[PDB]
């Protein structure tokens, strides 16, 4: 650090004048370190910069990170240090090693005036980060509403996106910012924009149980049957996270209760997995298929039995599920309850008529499994009712699931 760097940053107009008169120059080393002008900008020391600029200070001089003096002026939210850097000749579209322009920065802090000042002067709003963002995206993330307006009132791209496909509307919903959403749609933010996984804004709101946002999205046309690459709908997500009120809203908007994903999973199936009786109610009342099957042949009972929640297993049974529903490989809701050692379900399944003498495509009978896993409490209950091993003899059984 030269005496002039310390001078500028400290705001010592006296000295800075002196050093510059006595032959000192604004931009010393021909490398890329922060200059006395950058130092000037940050501290907001205007006169000091109104000087260095007089002399020959470079305004587009780049620092380590490639950030320019103008980039600092911005971060601070010092409109005048900006109206000045600009007034002279700072290029507003110079990016940082990450792709940030003074504009994104201003955007993040929510420095309305600074942004306006930046727009007035060719500051491009198409400028993208390497994360795939634009000033509007940033606006939406840190929920800066009037930056969003101003930005839109002046040709922002309602739904420009990087390589991930995340549109401003996508971000906005993600960081629950109704203010921005209700603001984007009219200006054209599309409710259909697919992300890198095919997720449409409604998928998000649906998952994070945001009825408010969901309503809007639907209102403007968004489909509740839009498919992720997995073939997963917003209904799936909403059901899987047990968000009942939403699962109701969606259904009441042509959401297809029986539509399954890439492998065959129907919302009810996922509901059986996490076991949320309420949603399970909403769907069956609506008229979903109770014993809808996967590609392999698992029913929501198979699934509800396999995993924990026995409560849901009652519900499915009460609502007439087929308790001897077999898989393409002979596995029944009992084999699962056994294989996972859920005694109480092996009690309930049997009680509700489940057959215990069913040999699978392997050779296993629910007792055979309970035994091999050393789950004893279960082996006891099956021991009695299970029949004779008219033969003697390790492949298991898992219901299909959604990925990552
Ligand atoms: Br609306
Ligand atoms: Cl320059
Ligand atoms: Cl200001
Ligand atoms: Cl993300
Ligand atoms: Cl994001
Ligand atoms: Cl995420
Ligand atoms: Cl928020
Ligand atoms: Cl099927
Ligand atoms: Cl389990
Ligand atoms: Cl469960």
Tab-separated table of N, CA, C and O and ligand atoms in Angstrom, residues 272-275 304 307-310 312, ligand 10:
chain	number	residue	atom	x	y	z
A	272	UNK	N	-48.380	-43.201	1.400
A	272	UNK	CA	-48.262	-44.407	2.226
A	272	UNK	C	-46.860	-44.534	2.788
A	272	UNK	O	-46.660	-45.026	3.889
A	273	UNK	N	-45.884	-44.091	2.017
A	273	UNK	CA	-44.491	-44.169	2.436
A	273	UNK	C	-44.269	-43.337	3.692
A	273	UNK	O	-43.872	-43.866	4.727
A	274	UNK	N	-44.537	-42.037	3.595
A	274	UNK	CA	-44.377	-41.128	4.724
A	274	UNK	C	-45.565	-41.246	5.680
A	274	UNK	O	-45.543	-40.713	6.781
A	275	UNK	N	-46.613	-41.930	5.249
A	275	UNK	CA	-47.780	-42.098	6.101
A	275	UNK	C	-48.468	-40.863	6.677
A	275	UNK	O	-48.353	-40.608	7.880
A	304	UNK	N	-47.289	-48.977	2.476
A	304	UNK	CA	-47.593	-48.552	3.839
A	304	UNK	C	-47.190	-49.608	4.868
A	304	UNK	O	-46.879	-49.277	6.019
A	307	UNK	N	-42.931	-49.761	5.088
A	307	UNK	CA	-42.378	-48.733	5.961
A	307	UNK	C	-43.145	-48.719	7.291
A	307	UNK	O	-43.957	-49.607	7.572
A	308	UNK	N	-42.888	-47.704	8.105
A	308	UNK	CA	-43.546	-47.609	9.402
A	308	UNK	C	-45.067	-47.559	9.486
A	308	UNK	O	-45.734	-48.579	9.296
A	309	UNK	N	-45.589	-46.353	9.758
A	309	UNK	CA	-47.024	-46.061	9.956
A	309	UNK	C	-48.022	-47.164	9.647
A	309	UNK	O	-48.264	-47.532	8.485
A	310	UNK	N	-48.600	-47.654	10.742
A	310	UNK	CA	-49.590	-48.707	10.745
A	310	UNK	C	-50.946	-48.018	10.641
A	310	UNK	O	-51.912	-48.593	10.121
A	312	UNK	N	-51.895	-45.643	8.724
A	312	UNK	CA	-52.283	-45.589	7.323
A	312	UNK	C	-52.672	-46.968	6.794
A	312	UNK	O	-53.495	-47.074	5.881
B	10	LIG	CL1	-45.513	-45.201	7.299
